[PDB]
């Protein structure tokens, strides 16, 4: 496993029943956000980490041919077939970072 981004952003998931934006793992904050490349089998998955306490929020595959849509500068999202999640990034700079890996990633695939 190699991470191939770090990025700072607060990792939410939609309450499709009351239509909402949650936080991820329960807690409002930010995490450290990877893509990590598993270089033997040429898989990647997101996995982010709250900064306070460490808690994964967030460790979900990317696979083949996922869109990933960039609604705003800041803000990123993205589905699989039980959740949609977005993440709030803390910076443009986060954003664009954790996009040119996920662009990669899925170029790669
Ligand atoms: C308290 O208020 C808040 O929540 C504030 C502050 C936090 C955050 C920041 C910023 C803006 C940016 C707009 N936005 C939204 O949520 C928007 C507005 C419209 C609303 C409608 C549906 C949503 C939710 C569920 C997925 N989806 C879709 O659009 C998805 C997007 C999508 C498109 C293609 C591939 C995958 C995906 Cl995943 N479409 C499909 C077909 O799946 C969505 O995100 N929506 C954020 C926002 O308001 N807020």
Known sequence: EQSICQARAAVMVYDDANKKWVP???????????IYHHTGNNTFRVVGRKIQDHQVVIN???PKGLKYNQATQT??????????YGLNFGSKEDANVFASAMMHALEVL
Not at 24 to 34: K, L, M
């Open 24 to 34: 991820a793992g329960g807690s409002t904050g930010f995490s450290r956000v990877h």
């Open 60 to 62: 979900c595959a990317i």
């Open 75 to 84: 803000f990123h999202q993205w589905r699989d077939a039980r959740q949609v």
